[PDB]
Amino acid sequence: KTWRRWHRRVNTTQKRYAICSALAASALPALVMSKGHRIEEVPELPLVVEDK
Amino acid sequence: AKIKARDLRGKKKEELLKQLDDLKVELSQLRVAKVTGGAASKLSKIRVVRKSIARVLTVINQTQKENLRKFYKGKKYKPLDLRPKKTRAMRRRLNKHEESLKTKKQQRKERLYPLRKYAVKA
Amino acid sequence: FIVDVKANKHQIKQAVKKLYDIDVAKVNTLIRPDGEKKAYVRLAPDYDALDVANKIGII
Amino acid sequence: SSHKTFRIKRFLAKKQKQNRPIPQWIWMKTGNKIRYNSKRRHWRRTKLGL
Amino acid sequence: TKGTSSFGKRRNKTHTLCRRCGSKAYHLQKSTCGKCGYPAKRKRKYNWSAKAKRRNTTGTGRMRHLKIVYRRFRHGFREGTTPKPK
Amino acid sequence: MKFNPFVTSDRSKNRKRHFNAPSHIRRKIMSSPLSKELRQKYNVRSMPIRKDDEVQVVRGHYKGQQIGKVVQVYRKKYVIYIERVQREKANGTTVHVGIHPSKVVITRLKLDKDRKKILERKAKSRQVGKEKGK
Amino acid sequence: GRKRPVPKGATYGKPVHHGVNQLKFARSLQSVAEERAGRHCGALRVLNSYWVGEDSTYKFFEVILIDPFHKAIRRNPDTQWITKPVHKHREMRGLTSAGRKSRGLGKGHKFHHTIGGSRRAAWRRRNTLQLHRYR
RNA sequence: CGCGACCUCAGAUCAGACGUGGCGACCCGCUGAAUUUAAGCAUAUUAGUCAGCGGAGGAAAAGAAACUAACCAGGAUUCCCUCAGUAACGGCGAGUGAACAGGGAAGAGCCCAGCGCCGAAUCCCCGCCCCGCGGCGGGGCGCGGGAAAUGUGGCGUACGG
RNA sequence: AAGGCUAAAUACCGGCACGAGACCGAUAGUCAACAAGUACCGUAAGGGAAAGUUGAAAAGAACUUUGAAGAGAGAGUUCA
RNA sequence: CGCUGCGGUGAGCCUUGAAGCCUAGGGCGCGGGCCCGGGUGGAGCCGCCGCAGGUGCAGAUCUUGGUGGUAGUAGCAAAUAUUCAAACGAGAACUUUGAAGGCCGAAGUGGAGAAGGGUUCCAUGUGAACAGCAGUUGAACAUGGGUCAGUCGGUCCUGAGAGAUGGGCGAGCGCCGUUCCGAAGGGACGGGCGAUGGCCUCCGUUGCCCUCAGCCGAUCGAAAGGGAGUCGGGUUCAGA
RNA sequence: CGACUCUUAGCGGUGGAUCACUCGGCUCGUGCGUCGAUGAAGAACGCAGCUAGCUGCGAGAAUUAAUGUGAAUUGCAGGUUGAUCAUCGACACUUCGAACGCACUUGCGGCCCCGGGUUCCUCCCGGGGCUACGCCUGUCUGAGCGUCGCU
């Protein structure tokens, strides 16, 4: 049927939790390598470039 | 001669008919050639004749119609052929004038209380 | 002739009389099983149908 | 029946002109899948209704 | 005798071609089409047969005058105009 | 990526519109690139192929440096017949092998009044892309 | 009243439905009048009706019709609402004054079973699962 | 008797119009079951549902309170969230079951009859003139015809006038 | 109260025209991917199928040979 | 363990051959299963971390499709009956001709029609399929042909009946009813007036007035009932 | 060794599973939201050089005109001052069908006007236009021991 429960709702604080855990893992080079990203020559992992 | 409709519209009426039956005649004897085992070349011509008869008939009908709706231009009643045929539902709607009719009372409101153009400050 | 299925013996008589400039004695019509109407047109004795067939092409 | 009406006779005329095989040259067309006429009615097997 | 022998006496049609729906369901003695109710002004249609509805509705035929309305609609039913000549 | 919401990207819809395109649309799909010597002469990339156009086959079994004019554009089969591109049948008669226009480079065009006005337009709007961008 | 049109009584159901005689029509006899006058003159538009007399077997009503294609009606802004196509056969849909009363609509606690458009509008909204996306 | 009004009522291939039939997903008005559940079954339930009949529209219907309330009060209709599986109904069994307040979407209000004033100040149609004339309309001129005093139009409707 | 009108928010398994999919992939998905409401069945109301795929391109096997022929043996086409 | 799809990931695999299928090949796992080799095939596929489910068949007198054993078997036995020679032909128990012997035996196995069938009629050609053996034949197949009316029927009439309008009923589609609650005749004669056309002669045409009227139930209902009037000879491959 | 029977494998048949394809569905969403007495929906019959179905079309019949497009269509033939496609606003649109002169056999009318037929003299033939029901406004002709008025 079409009225199967397709969508799900997650607590807003749990959504915000996951984004904090996602960003915080983007600063660990061992976790980004393990994701397969070829980043062995990036100067610094939390890569920041000027607003230009 | 490839009969083109650009070439027919300038001609007078009763000479178009003189050209119409001329093609009617040629179509008949072409149909006779179809049963008497005629050449393949003539058999392919009856399609040219058939579509040429449709052309001259089309010009005749068109020029006759526009002479009519030019004769019924300023008249009140006109034949049902010349009245605009568009979805019977909207042949029944009120005119472009009737639906614009406002009562003397309703007109008096617009003159007295027109909707103003304003703006509120922050 | 294979006439149109709507025509009468009267219309058929005056048609051949006008298309081929000939006189007709009588016309017998039947409706073929396939649908079209066949008309046997007997010419008046003063016209020979054998030559009339040559003017219109059938022979 | 030998006594027919013009409605019936004209109807039987149509069902008779439809009973022919397909012309040979049509399966020389490009996008042609037709192999033969699948609506051939035989007067003894299928009885045309009526 | 109610079987094979009695099928021999079948030589009288009750129905014939209705001249409104074309189906062979025009009952002769009752003078009424059992498929469209021909002498009745209104067409015979029932909701208890959805399948018999869709066999005969507005999209099954030619729509020789309705498929033109669908085309004239997408221009506002313009009339009396012609494209500018060459 | 495409962002126009009214342009489909469905595989089945694009193939249906391709295999059922009317004749005047078949003409556009059957376009061919021009040779390098013609590409900077008219400043035009590609062009729909006409009945009498000199042609080189670039891909397939008949590729080579031979020039051959088109003899017919079989739009129903999405294919063109080039004069010398033919094969031997069984009974000794030759038959034109069909080549797809995309696998063909135009070496000389069949100019006429209608053809020239196309080339200039494809060149006029091409310059707009270089005068608006630069 | 209205007796159930079934042959010889035979209401082959449960005893709650065996009634044949003391059944009453849901619409007034005046609303039946407006319908019969509107069905006969299909070209006209029923406006209202009123009581003009009765006896033991008949009620007489006078229905007020309007011909929506008369220029006196067509060109008058006060009455040209009746000319719109949405008012075709007001009496068949129960929109006249006499017809509205049988629908049981109005403001207040007495007319709860027609909140919404009508009695069917209320029933739908009350017997419809609103299965939201997220429940 | 005659003649003429008027009122009722007829006949026209009278002049000009309009209605019918289709579709029917959605909508409005009727009509309206029984399987089923109750571990049987008759009230209930299924259900104002299916079938049946009529009528529409691009939406329909509803709608500017003979309302809700009992507050320090709200303020047309429709829709959503909630009220609430609640008050209530019910072999008080099985089961059935709203509303107000509150938060939103949207938001728009109006017209007659009557009561009275104005010399019927009103409307339709024919003929002529002008303007446009595939939504036959506007203006003018007609001791041209008709409708209308058994009531047309303007003012004016409960917020008062 | 017992007369009337009124947009918007709302509904839409039909129609016209589009877009999409954690859907089905020819016994599935619509009954119907195909000359499908077709063939066919029934007096009728109605009931109602099966059926997609050569190859890149017909280049669809010239010619020889046995046979009345269907069919074979060679030869040939093709990456096959 | 296995199936299908989705988000990630394997600088994964693949026209130097993917999926699928076959296998007396080599092995792994208690097992579900899996991995190699070989063959076939010709264009896509898989591992791992998560996600999702129309996810695993031996059965349901299961559903659809296919194929066996039975089995070269039961069977091709109702209505007396065939034989010789020839021709055509690749080919004859069966076709055709001739002869012989028989049957139907005028309540026919004959000659014609109605209903029904709908091209089966006729000719030429073919022998794939079909005609439960065969076929040189056919009602099969493929090409073409063929049905002629004042007088024969239909058409007209009414029958048992059916069925509109008026009217009545009905929520309503509609129904009842057929002379019943009806202003139900659009005709005719003559006269009078006006008018026209053809030698406006005389007649025809028309309008108006006058005069007269029983009509009586619209309409449908018979290819056997009612119903004016065609017969003889000849002619075609098939129509008289 | 045989024949027959059984098992396994190769090959070949029968059969059409599997796999891979997909101009089809299914579901959700968006915009619009338009039939007909000016004859609809539906039905029938016709229409192509060779054409049965499907598709398209209506005796102007696989279409005419117009505009856009700019050299094909194609199974085989034939034949740029615009082929072919698309669009579609002009024109046309057979017979049934609400279906409309009456009937449903396509059967019988009636009226008016033209042309043969006359030489309007009645016919006959052909052609054209009309001839349905309900209802509205108006017109005309009427009816009534209905209510009156005047002679």
From Swiss-Prot, chain B:
Q: Which domain of life is it from?
A: Eukaryota
Q: Which GO terms describe its cellular component?
A: cytosolic large ribosomal subunit
Q: Which CDD domains match?
A: Ribosomal_L29_HIP (cd00427)
Residues found modified as Phosphoserine: S28
The Gene Ontology biological process annotation of the record reads:
maturation of LSU-rRNA from tricistronic rRNA transcript (SSU-rRNA, 5.8S rRNA, LSU-rRNA); translation
**Which N-terminal residues, if any, form the signal peptide?**
none
Q: Where is this region: Disordered?
A: 84-122
Residues annotated as carrying N6-acetyllysine in the record are: K18, K42
Q: Compositional bias (Basic residues) spans? A: 85-95
Query: Cross-referenced PROSITE patterns, in alphabetical order?
Result: RIBOSOMAL_L29
The covalent link annotated as Glycyl lysine isopeptide (Lys-Gly) (interchain with G-Cter in SUMO2) occurs at K24
Q: Where does this one sit in the cell?
A: Cytoplasm
Query: Can the keyword Acetylation be found in this entry's annotation?
Result: yes
> Coiled-coil ranges per the record?
none
Give the main location. Answer: cytoplasm
Q: Output the Gene Ontology terms for molecular function.
A: mRNA binding; structural constituent of ribosome
For whether the record's keyword set contains Acyltransferase, the answer is no
- Keyword annotations: Acetylation, Cytoplasm, Isopeptide bond, Phosphoprotein, Ribonucleoprotein, Ribosomal protein, Ubl conjugation
Role, per record: Component of the large ribosomal subunit. The ribosome is a large ribonucleoprotein complex responsible for the synthesis of proteins in the cell.
Describe the subunit structure: Component of the large ribosomal subunit.
Which family is this protein grouped under?
Belongs to the universal ribosomal protein uL29 family.
Q: What HAMAP family would the database entry show?
A: Ribosomal_uL29
Specify the protein name. Answer: Large ribosomal subunit protein uL29
Organism this protein belongs to? Oryctolagus cuniculus
Q: What is the gene called?
A: RPL35
Curated annotation (Swiss-Prot), chain C:
Q: Where in the cell is it found?
A: Cytoplasm; Nucleus
Domain of life where this protein originates: Eukaryota
Q: How is it modified after translation?
A: N-terminus is methylated by METTL11A/NTM1.
Its family remark reads:
Belongs to the universal ribosomal protein uL23 family.
- Quaternary structure per UniProt? Component of the large ribosomal subunit. Interacts with LYAR and GNL2. Interacts with MDM2; this interaction may promote MDM2-mediated p53/TP53 polyubiquitination. Directly interacts (via BIB domain) with IPO5, IPO7, KPNB1 and TNPO1; these interactions are involved in RPL23A nuclear import for the assembly of ribosomal subunits. Interacts with IPO8.
Note what the entry says on domains: The N-terminal beta-like import receptor binding (BIB) domain mediates interaction with IPO5, IPO7, KPNB1 and TNPO1.
Q: What does this protein do?
A: Component of the large ribosomal subunit. The ribosome is a large ribonucleoprotein complex responsible for the synthesis of proteins in the cell. Binds a specific region on the 26S rRNA. May promote p53/TP53 degradation possibly through the stimulation of MDM2-mediated TP53 polyubiquitination.
Report what the protein is called: Large ribosomal subunit protein uL23
Gene responsible for this protein: RPL23A
UniProtKB/Swiss-Prot annotation, chain F:
Q: Which SUPFAM superfamilies does this UniProt record tie to the protein?
A: Translation proteins SH3-like domain (SSF50104)
Q: Name one GO cellular component term.
A: large ribosomal subunit
UniProt keyword terms in alphabetical order:
Cytoplasm, Isopeptide bond, Phosphoprotein, Ribonucleoprotein, Ribosomal protein, Ubl conjugation
In its record, the post-translational modification comment is:
Ufmylated by UFL1 in response to endoplasmic reticulum stress, promoting reticulophagy of endoplasmic reticulum sheets.
The region called Disordered is annotated at 1-21
Q: Which domain of life is it from?
A: Eukaryota
> Its Gene Ontology biological processes?
translation
In terms of Gene3D superfamilies, this protein maps to: 2.30.30.30
Its chief place of residence is: cytoplasm
Where is this chain's protein located in or outside the cell?
Cytoplasm
Q: Extract the GO molecular function terms from the UniProt entry.
A: RNA binding; structural constituent of ribosome
Keyword Metal-binding found: no
* Classification via HAMAP family: Ribosomal_uL24_A
Q: What does the subunit section of this Swiss-Prot or TrEMBL entry state?
A: Component of the large ribosomal subunit. Interacts with DHX33.
The UniProt similarity line reads: Belongs to the universal ribosomal protein uL24 family.
**Physiological role:** Component of the large ribosomal subunit. The ribosome is a large ribonucleoprotein complex responsible for the synthesis of proteins in the cell.
Q: Sorted alphabetically, which NCBIfam families does this protein's record hold?
A: rplX_A_E (TIGR01080)
According to UniProt, the name of this protein is Large ribosomal subunit protein uL24
UniProtKB/Swiss-Prot annotation, chain G:
Similarity comment text for this entry? Belongs to the eukaryotic ribosomal protein eL15 family.
Q: Where in the cell is it found?
A: Cytoplasm
Could you say which residues of the full protein are shown?
Answer: 70 to 204 of 204
Q: What name does the UniProt record give this protein? A: Large ribosomal subunit protein eL15
Q: What is the lineage of its organism?
A: Eukaryota, Metazoa, Chordata, Craniata, Vertebrata
Give the chief site where it resides: cytoplasm
Q: Which residues carry this modification: Phosphoserine?
A: S28, S31
Please tell me which positions the record assigns to the cross-link Glycyl lysine isopeptide (Lys-Gly) (interchain with G-Cter in SUMO2). K14
Q: Does the keyword Cell membrane apply?
A: no
Recorded GO molecular functions are: RNA binding; structural constituent of ribosome
